[PDB]
Design a protein around this ligand. Structure first.
Ligand SMILES: C/C(=C\C=C/[C@@H](C)C(=O)O)[C@H]1CN[C@H](C(=O)O)[C@H]1CC(=O)O
Ligand SMILES: C/C(=C\C=C/[C@@H](C)C(=O)O)[C@H]1CN[C@H](C(=O)O)[C@H]1CC(=O)O
Lengths: 145, 194, 97, 49
């Protein structure tokens, strides 16, 4: 209407909308080629030293029962800690989601989003009264420079 | 026969204990990883637990006054509500208020760069919110009235002003403790074995 | 090196990059220093302000910058043994004993 | 988490919150432009009865 009141337009030969281009979530595929998808190797070096000490104890030797108990509790604590770290990583992975709509982009400010400088899309978002698009326009005007 | 039931009772009792420990550890790591620090001006525009502010008598406060961002307007509203309570006049008053109290101080990037080179306990949050220039006022008919874009711009192109700029301010754990406890248990087992 | 003029660098008598008082309307500080028979030539930039850019011959700024937040950073570590030091009570470890 | 602030009162709408209808309350944050108190005012005016 800002252009319709100044010059005259015909009937539109085609209709369209405004939507979001985004990089496809396929890609960045985790595997054993990529390092540190499991935890840090310092813990693995420490448990290799633990197994070496266990082999040393079995080499130099009731007492075996408490050796097995200490080894049992130590390994159980380490595997439980690894399980808790893996569960926390999976929970913060599944807690985040890929963006599916405009409000999903409006909540998460990690991904930048804007439009063409002074185009009809930014003119629409400037003259927008719905709170989701108002928040998106406020974010765009925050990073307007 | 009963000793096997006793050992099984101890077995799933220890399993229940370590399952509860695993659940508590997972909850603690999840609430630790879920926490996020301040990384935008909208964090200060929304969260009111950490009081903030700037210098008095205009400059940045004038940009707060004629703000149209509608989040910077909210920051201006909070700062005008806390004008008499939490606000400082000079830069050093707010800088020590950052170190002492839970306070965030809004400044130009030059002084923030200066204090982050000065102290490693300080950090910069956010980019250029308001684009601000610094210059030197000039007489009518002065040569540097035109030579601010000619001669002083040529000194900036040669980087002599950049030479002054770069001259003045310039530029595990619990697992190891568990392994220590394991080594102490090995020492105790050798002492039993004697 | 541009001109060769002489200059005496002096402190200002107000100590302010002064704005106006809206109850009076007069502009104070360095803005009043350019009207109180010291130098009709502009001296101080007062950073960038719109009415401060309405002064007699405000030049272009040589330096460009923005406004950001200075904030102290938090830091912490967990040394020693803290598997025994959960938020659960040590009476659970007493029950283990 | 435990609430400890009016900011988390503005964040959490599961615990209902309000004030006295007439007087200093419902007038202080009605005119206020701070976003936490404005959201609390919007929540309280949504549940004015
Ligand atoms: C400290 C200060 C302003 C605050 C209060 C008093 C001293 C005043 O100048 O009226 C100045 C310092 N120079 C900046 C300017 O020229 O705009 C301003 C604050 C700043 O942005 O660093
Ligand atoms: C609880 C109260 C009033 C309650 C009911 C009636 C009598 C009224 O609002 O007129 C008072 C307490 N002092 C407040 C004041 O001085 O404005 C007023 C309202 C409030 O609690 O803010």
């Amino acid at each position: 209407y800002v252009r319709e009141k100044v010059i005259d337009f015909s009937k539109p030969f085609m209709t369209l909308g405004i939507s979001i281009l985004y990089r496809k979530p396929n890609g960045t595929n985790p595997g054993v080629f990529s390092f540190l998808n499991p935890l840090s190797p310092d813990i693995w070096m420490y448990v290799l030293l633990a197994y070496l000490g266990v082999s040393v104890v079995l080499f130099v030797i009731l007492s075996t029962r408490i050796v097995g108990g200490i080894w049992w509790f130590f390994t159980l604590i380490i595997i439980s800690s690894y399980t808790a770290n893996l569960a926390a990583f999976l929970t913060v992975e599944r807690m985040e989601s890929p963006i599916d709509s405009a409000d999903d982009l409006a909540k998460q400010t990690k991904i930048e989003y804007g439009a063409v400088e002074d185009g009809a899309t930014m003119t629409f978002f400037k003259k927008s009264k719905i709170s989701t698009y108002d928040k998106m326009w406020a974010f765009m005007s925050s990073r307007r420079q | 026969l009963s000793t096997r039931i006793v050992g099984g009772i101890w077995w799933f009792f220890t399993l229940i204990i370590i399952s509860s420990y695993t659940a508590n550890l997972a909850a603690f790591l999840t609430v630790e990883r879920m926490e996020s620090p301040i990384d935008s001006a909208d964090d200060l525009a929304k969260q009111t637990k950490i009081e903030y502010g700037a210098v008095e008598d205009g400059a940045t406060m004038t940009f707060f006054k004629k703000s149209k961002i509608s989040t910077y307007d909210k920051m201006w509203a909070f700062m005008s509500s806390r004008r008499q309570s939490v606000l400082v006049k000079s830069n050093e008053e707010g800088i020590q208020r950052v170190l002492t109290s839970d306070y965030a101080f809004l400044m130009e990037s030059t002084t923030i760069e200066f204090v982050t080179q000065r102290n490693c306990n300080l950090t910069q949050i956010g980019g250029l919110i308001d684009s601000k220039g610094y210059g030197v006022g000039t007489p009518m008919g002065s040569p540097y009235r035109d030579k601010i874009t000619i001669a002083i711009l040529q000194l900036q192109e040669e980087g002599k002003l950049h030479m002054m700029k770069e001259k003045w301010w310039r530029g595990v754990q619990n697992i190891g403790g568990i392994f220590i406890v394991l080594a102490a248990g090995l020492v105790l087992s050798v002492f039993v074995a004697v | 090196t541009i001109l060769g003029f002489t200059y005496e660098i002096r402190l200002v008598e107000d100590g302010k990059y002064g704005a106006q008082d809206d109850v009076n309307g007069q502009w104070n500080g360095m803005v009043r220093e350019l009207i109180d028979h010291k130098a009709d030539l502009a001296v101080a930039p007062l950073a960038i302000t719109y009415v401060r850019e309405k002064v007699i011959d405000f030049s272009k700024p040589f330096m460009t910058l923005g406004i950001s937040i200075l904030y102290r950073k938090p830091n912490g570590t967990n040394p020693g043994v803290f598997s025994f030091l959960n938020p659960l009570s040590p009476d659970i470890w007493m029950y283990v004993l």
